[PDB]
């Protein structure tokens, strides 16, 4: 038989034993995960060796061996904190959801500190963040800290 | 809502480098660290490093 066993480390500390072949898809290690331990695939990224593993692509491609070892990171969804940080030292601490857009993340800024949304300009990873946009499209996570600049503005 | 301690610290930068292990990744993960002193949870802080939000 060309099956064989590999191991799947989750950062909850638990490690799933699965049975494999070389010519798996990522896909199917991930269905595998889900009948076992109920995982969506949708939010499974698997890495080997530090390196983030494609769904089309199979164990064989990424040189994955008998006893080999992958790590699991679950994508998180739902409400979470955000913090911002201004010029003048403070830390504004926000609730918000991966689908807030960045004009509703401004208004939650204008509702704890009075702040005109236009004289805003965020912050996340050196990039502007555009208004149009959500949180999940620029990747903000969790706990994660964004920039307010306040714009000159006539008043 | 509490930004982490040193030992916090190491120990999510311990955890990630298990993780992520090649020199490119190491700067990385530290100067993510460096940026968020709030993050304290693990797959939030590797999706940072998986998708270059360095």
Same mark, same amino acid.
């Given at each position: 038989?060309?099956?064989?066993?590999?191991?799947?480390?989750?950062?909850?500390?638990?490690?799933?034993?699965?049975?494999?072949?070389?010519?798996?898809?990522?896909?199917?290690?991930?269905?595998?995960?889900?009948?076992?331990?109920?995982?969506?695939?949708? !939010?499974?990224? @698997?890495?080997?060796?530090?390196?983030?593993?494609?769904?089309?692509?199979? @164990?064989?491609?990424?040189?994955?061996?008998?006893?080999?070892?992958?790590?699991?990171?679950?994508?998180?969804?739902?409400?979470? !904190?955000?913090?911002?940080?201004?010029?003048?030292?403070?830390?504004?601490?926000?609730?918000?959801?991966?689908?807030?857009?960045?004009?509703?993340?401004?208004?939650?800024? !204008?509702?704890?500190?009075?702040?005109?949304?236009?004289?805003?300009?965020?912050?996340?990873?050196?990039?502007?963040?555009?208004?149009?946009?959500?949180?999940?499209?620029?990747?903000?996570?969790?706990?994660?800290?964004?920039?307010?600049?306040?714009?000159?503005?006539?008043? | 809502?509490?930004?982490?301690?040193?030992?916090?610290?190491?120990?999510?930068?311990?955890?990630? @480098?298990?993780?992520?292990?090649?020199?490119?990744?190491?700067?990385?993960?530290?100067?993510? @660290?460096?940026?968020?002193?709030?993050?304290?949870?693990?797959?939030?802080?590797?999706?940072?490093?998986?998708?270059?939000?360095?």
């Amino acid at each position: 038989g060309s099956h064989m066993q590999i191991f799947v480390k989750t950062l909850t500390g638990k490690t799933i034993t699965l049975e494999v072949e070389p010519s798996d898809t990522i896909e199917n290690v991930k269905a595998k995960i889900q009948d076992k331990e109920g995982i969506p695939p949708d !939010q499974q990224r @698997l890495i080997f060796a530090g390196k983030q593993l494609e769904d089309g692509r199979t @164990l064989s491609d990424y040189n994955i061996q008998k006893e080999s070892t992958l790590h699991l990171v679950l994508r998180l969804r739902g409400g979470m !904190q955000i913090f911002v940080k201004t010029l003048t030292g403070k830390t504004i601490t926000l609730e918000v959801e991966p689908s807030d857009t960045i004009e509703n993340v401004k208004a939650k800024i !204008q509702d704890k500190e009075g702040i005109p949304p236009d004289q805003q300009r965020l912050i996340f990873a050196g990039k502007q963040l555009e208004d149009g946009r959500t949180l999940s499209d620029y990747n903000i996570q969790k706990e994660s800290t964004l920039h307010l600049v306040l714009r000159l503005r006539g008043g | 809502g509490s930004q982490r301690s040193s030992a916090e610290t190491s120990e999510l930068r311990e955890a990630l @480098l298990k993780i992520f292990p090649d020199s490119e990744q190491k700067l990385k993960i530290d100067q993510i @660290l460096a940026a968020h002193p709030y993050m304290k949870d693990l797959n939030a802080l590797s999706a940072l490093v998986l998708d270059g939000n360095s």
